[PDB]
């Protein structure tokens, strides 16, 4: 009956990630055994998938890297790791992934995406950008 | 001249209300210090009550005095009940602000204030 | 083996239990708390991360200061913050709570809850998207993930 | 005089006072109040810390946007001190612990570190350097802590002349280790004392008076090579002081004699605990050392701070030791202690 | 036109069957077992929850989030120090102190935004006549200290050498509405 | 024809204008300067001593059943000697009309309360006092409703600075929330936006 | 095009740096002073000077509505080259 059909789909998910070790790397790391079409990959390592059958919101997902900039992000995975060209697609702002519709290239757009930094070094520290407004008087260097 | 009265025929009559409000506070300092755990002793609490009155002892308009008394009773109502907590009652004592100086030379040394 | 190594694993154990059981306090002041409910709503369930709302400060680990903090309320917020047993965390949410926000220049708004409670993470926005607060909660969880409290104890 | 350092404003937050300061004991008990009085006015306090970033959390108050900068360091490891005392104008060294740890002796917390802070500050080019010792810091002393501070006080001055050596008496405060100590003797049925506390005189000083003194020590043009002694008034007798603590903390009072040799060995037992010990052989001797007179030193009055009597600011700390049926009692019902000029 | 919500139509009409229907209702909790039925249905439904870190909820091109100072394709800064984004900002979050750039152009020497004062209202991007300041989709930039939310021109150009691959597509897909 | 300009239903201007005169000659002892605006809304100015008779009349009278007190505001105008211009907006639910009643006041010239007539005033009635310092007679409770328990001020007065005179912060020396004089980190930037040209010639004021 | 000041600090495109003796440098200790390395003076100069046929040439950002307001330059000068006021582009004739 239909119960065999769904139990057959479960076998596909549990045995559709290369092997056992492949299942482990995603089950405890993403809590999502689903499998869908591989739309593309980043230069950092992020893998983007899509499954049109599922409902809105759950039909596009990432499997993040294990390392982005010498960070060891196997566990410490945060949302600020999707590069801009995919952040548009992953958030359902467009139907076209950057694999088929590449972003316009410019000589000043960042090549290496930088995740959010809040407590690690290489942190943002605000400062004033204007120069001095009042110049003091320098006295003569010799008496009288 | 020719201004309508508010709870005061003349200054002397309005001075009785102030004396009535003072008797309401002097009887009240020993109950707030205990009802809400204040770090002050009753002797110095009554001093602040008296001090807040000498701040306004130079006024002579009957209408103004009545409004001062009306506000004081409201200030007393919020203290009779514990509507205003230890944070609000201890706000009068100014236990944190640096004592602003009076000597001109001290003012001249720090800041551009007159 | 070294005694330091065992210490860190215990440090990571105590931190882990404090990461996956982060109970906030039903303390939404105004107008960000509507998006603090959406965080509790079906789409962005907080029970996923073992995050459960509890009314009593005595049983709350984190305090989400969401909404404008006014002078009349300032004494109450500090009192509630004091009641939370340590270790406790504060997650300032929204512009009104981070700084003064839209009411920075009003006469009855404390310009940011950082003046009254020590804030651990600031979630910008007005209101922050339910994801923006969830990124804040997760970024708070990664803060506990690196405490080093038992590791320093061996060094004392 | 860089234009940034010049003082500005009416005094308070969001102001400038030109008191860029490196406080090396901010996480402690006296450091909390020193930073507060620096941060209450306009001062950029650099707070070196080795603790958890959680234990320094409470210090992110009492200072406007970016008036605090937290840096990590290790006392043994050089080149982390210089990185913190580089741009500062005044360095306030409050480092001090009342017991030995596995890594740090008293020599390594009262003599070595102040030398490293002092040497790293003179080379850096600071103007002042405020140091804290104890009033009973005589070389000819009995406590291991007091004697070490005596050497550290001399060694700090030799490396860094024109230092300000502050010598507070036993400091009492909210999270202190003086009134919160005797008040905690209730957990044992009685309060052991040496010679019932007679022949011992204490001159407690309030923290805010001490921190006001430290904060005004980085302003007053004089007091650049002087040695102070913040003692406070009302030299009580230890029996009368502890009897008064239980007067506010309406518990009991059952003093009894106890030789100092037994009362030290028992104290030495509590010093074996890996955590913060309750008592130690060194803390037994400090509590039972008569405080010298302040005659030959300037003191608080010569610096612009009014000493605060114990009776005024004792209920703030001893309220939490009361129980219900005595939590609401006031200062009036205590018959305060008797001062002794002995 | 009104509508009665809790007004009985006609009453005083009950027989044994109607009487026993109410007895059965009250005396066997029929309308409470009816409420249980709905919750039981909901258990057998797919939860709406989405794994936030791995699948992120939907947005729109007009979304208003982190700020960003844009540049022309050549590389030149768009902002020309016209200073009417701080005229309309209803929180006085923006400050500008522009001076001539020594090559003749009118450019800014300070463009600091206080993200703790900002209310993400979008008036500054619709006031700018060169699209110099925009608001990219970055809603996730929470920090661990108040200071990193006080953005300055250097941060705002970094956010703008980063999200242009996104910001350009968003503007290119809603500028016709504007 | 003119999609921009609002349609003008001049019928409701005549009805209001007739009623304003009807109220004017049925209560002459207090009524002053009844007027009707372009936007068809009536406006009656009343001597402050006549607040109760006018408000009681406009509620009970059969032809004026203004039973709902929409709000009780107050406009501060330092120009005029009687600064505070208390406003009463009223609603009918019978004749489907709104009527405004205005009186003047002063920081030393209180006004009689209305809680006897409209209980809705009660909270609005304190809000004016808390915000403008306009004492009201015969009120039951009359305490601050909005401001903190320790404001020695009246925020909505035009002579009150926007940032206020006091700020709250937490202090460890005293272990409670304390109050200190305000020192803003970035001063409020007052924008001088007024144009120097006569936008509306219909409101010219000759010298 | 970022140059380091003698104190080792990085100068921004607005020419700012903190002196070696300024106390405000503390904020950068254990952190970094982010500066945008894509300067605006240098990038705009690397563009070629366009040559047109008319003596009056329009300039907009290029995309029309995505550029800057429509302006008109005068190219009668021969010693200098006309510059658009919004974007730093340049135009000549001949
Ligand atoms: C007491 C006996 C041990 C009880 C079991 C505790 C196991 C804790 C655990 O499951 O850690 C998994 C966790 C799983 O990672 P995590 O849950 O902490 O990190 C977050 C995971 N994502 C990204 C999916 C949200 O392992 C660790 O993080 C390392 C710390 C382990 C500490 C215990 C060491 C022994
Ligand atoms: C999985 C397990 C499922 C258990 C069943 C859960 C209820 C499912 C909802 C059914 C439903 O929709 O009912 C609608 C209806 C709603 O009724 P109604 O409100 O529309 O009534 C209309 C008018 N009258 C009253 C005249 C019919 O309820 C029922 O069909 C059944 C109501 C009677 C149930 C009596 C239960 C008594 C329980 C005690 C007996 C022991 C039970 C065994 C204990 C073990
Ligand atoms: N009764 C008193 O309190 C008296 C105090 N004093 C002096 O006051 C100063 C501080 O008083 P108090 O604050 O009450 O004592 P605390 O122990 O409360 O202050 C300890 C401070 O010193 C730091 N510290 C201690 N040992 C080391 C170390 N080995 N390496 C680095 N940092 C260290 C602590 O850092 P962490 O928090 O990481 O331990 C903490 O910041 C001391 O110098 C003491 O001698 C003088 C007379 C008596
Ligand atoms: S920050 Fe915005 S959303 Fe949050 S409380 Fe303030 S106004 Fe409301
Ligand atoms: S989004 Fe609104 S509040 Fe924020 S900077 Fe722009 S104009 Fe100001
Ligand atoms: S960002 Fe735009 S509106 Fe603001 S000053 Fe620059 S050009 Fe003008
Ligand atoms: Zn151009």
Short mmCIF file of C-alpha atoms in Angstrom, two decimals, chain A residues 30-31 77, chain C residues 16-24 39 43-52 130 133-135 137-139 141, chain E residues 49-54:
data_model
loop_
_atom_site.label_atom_id
_atom_site.label_comp_id
_atom_site.label_asym_id
_atom_site.label_seq_id
_atom_site.Cartn_x
_atom_site.Cartn_y
_atom_site.Cartn_z
CA UNK A 30 21.71 20.53 10.00
CA UNK A 31 18.94 18.33 11.47
CA UNK A 77 27.31 27.91 11.72
CA UNK C 16 26.45 23.41 26.39
CA UNK C 17 23.67 22.91 28.95
CA UNK C 18 23.47 26.70 29.23
CA UNK C 19 23.25 27.10 25.43
CA UNK C 20 20.44 24.66 24.64
CA UNK C 21 18.23 25.68 27.60
CA UNK C 22 18.19 29.47 27.24
CA UNK C 23 14.90 30.51 28.85
CA UNK C 24 13.93 34.15 28.20
CA UNK C 39 9.80 34.40 16.96
CA UNK C 43 7.54 29.69 11.40
CA UNK C 44 10.55 30.42 13.62
CA UNK C 45 9.91 28.09 16.56
CA UNK C 46 12.16 28.77 19.55
CA UNK C 47 11.40 25.41 21.13
CA UNK C 48 13.75 24.07 18.46
CA UNK C 49 16.72 25.51 20.37
CA UNK C 50 15.30 24.57 23.76
CA UNK C 51 14.24 28.19 24.26
CA UNK C 52 11.09 28.45 26.38
CA UNK C 130 11.93 37.59 13.57
CA UNK C 133 16.20 38.36 16.71
CA UNK C 134 16.79 34.67 16.08
CA UNK C 135 20.23 35.47 14.68
CA UNK C 137 19.70 34.49 20.06
CA UNK C 138 21.95 32.13 18.11
CA UNK C 139 24.78 34.65 18.28
CA UNK C 141 24.37 30.93 22.12
CA UNK E 49 8.67 25.71 11.07
CA UNK E 50 11.78 26.21 8.94
CA UNK E 51 15.38 25.57 9.96
CA UNK E 52 16.47 29.19 10.20
CA UNK E 53 20.26 28.85 9.71
CA UNK E 54 19.85 26.55 6.72
#
